[PDB]
Amino acid sequence: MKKLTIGLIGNPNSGKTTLFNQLTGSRQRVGNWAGVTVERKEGQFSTTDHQVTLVDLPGTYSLTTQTSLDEQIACHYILSGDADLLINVVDASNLERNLYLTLQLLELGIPCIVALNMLDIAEKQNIRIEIDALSARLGCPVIPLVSTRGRGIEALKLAIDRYKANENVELVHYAQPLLNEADSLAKVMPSDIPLKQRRWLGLQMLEGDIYSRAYAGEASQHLDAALARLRNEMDDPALHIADARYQCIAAICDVVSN
Numbered sequence: 001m002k003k004l005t006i007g008l009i010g011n012p013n014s015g016k017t018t019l020f021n022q023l024t025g026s027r028q029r030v031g032n033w034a035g036v037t038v039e040r041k042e043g044q045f046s047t048t049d050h051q052v053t054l055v056d057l058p059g060t061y062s063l064t065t066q067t068s069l070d071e072q073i074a075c076h077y078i079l080s081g082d083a084d085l086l087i088n089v090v091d092a093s094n095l096e097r098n099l100y101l102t103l104q105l106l107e108l109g110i111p112c113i114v115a116l117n118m119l120d121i122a123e124k125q126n127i128r129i130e131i132d133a134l135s136a137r138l139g140c141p142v143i144p145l146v147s148t149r150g151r152g153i154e155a156l157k158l159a160i161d162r163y164k165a166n167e168n169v170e171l172v173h174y175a176q177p178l179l180n181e182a183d184s185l186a187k188v189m190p191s192d193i194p195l196k197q198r199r200w201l202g203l204q205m206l207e208g209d210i211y212s213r214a215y216a217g218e219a220s221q222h223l224d225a226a227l228a229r230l231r232n233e234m235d236d237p238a239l240h241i242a243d244a245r246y247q248c249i250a251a252i253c254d255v256v257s258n
């Protein structure tokens with residue numbers, strides 16, 4: 001039977017293993033990622049409507065590439081198109097740090113559900129999150145979990161059964177020239193890669209990500225000239241990409257967290 005395929009992704013020590021184990025139980029297998037010794041781990045569970053294959057991905061701060069294997073493994077999987085959606089396990093006690101990865105996933109346009117974990121930890125650090133406010137800004141569902149107790153697991157399963165395209169909201173606000181160059185690069189990348197993904201790959205190349213150049217086909221030959229123009233228009237275009245992301249996250253966090 002064709003199963004619904006979900007990628008489980010989050011920072012290290014966010015409750016991803018614990019969430020995975022509560023969801024799949026004994027119904028899991030362990031192997032290795034193709035051509036490396038890093039453990040690949042997946043399992044099974046059901047919701048009301050769906051039979052799910054849950055693929056645990058290695059913990060990572062980001063999808064940007066002495067960049068660990070975990071990170072390239074996670075990014076390569078997200079970019080494959082194998083998953084129908086992702087569950088982004090976010091540690092509510094370190095929200096701003098954890099949202100770097102979330103934004104990366106949201107800019108790629110993959111259907112996403114945020115599992116907001118470590119809520120008790122947030123609580124007793126005197127922080128609470130405005131959950132719908134965060135959902136409104138992310139353009140995707142935000143489901144609160146205390147996953148060691150199994151709290152919100154039913155609500156997470158309910159959200160899987162309602163999965164749909166993220167709201168294509170504006171997130172990071174890049175200077176227009178960076179967007180114009182990302183688009184020029186996008187235009188000449190392989191036609192079968194979705195547009196949002198080609199535009200993401202383009203911004204990553206401009207930022208200095210080397211792995212991304214391998215997806216970009218002949219965009220790779222145009223990159224030096226794109227960077228020549230931007231250096232004439234601004235100080236450190238790559239730093240501007242980065243600050244744009246961090247401004248975005250910080251502004252979200254100001255409103256959502258207290």
Ligand SMILES: Nc1nc2c(ncn2[C@@H]2O[C@H](COP(=O)(O)OP(=O)(O)O)[C@@H](O)[C@H]2O)c(=O)[nH]1
Binds near residue numbers: 019
């Ligand atoms: N307080 C609390 N602890 C949690 C929660 N989820 C996981 N943990 C614990 O935090 C530690 C790290 O969790 P783990 O699932 O191993 O994280 P992973 O690296 O992302 O796979 C473990 O001891 C878990 O039992 C949660 O929602 N609340």
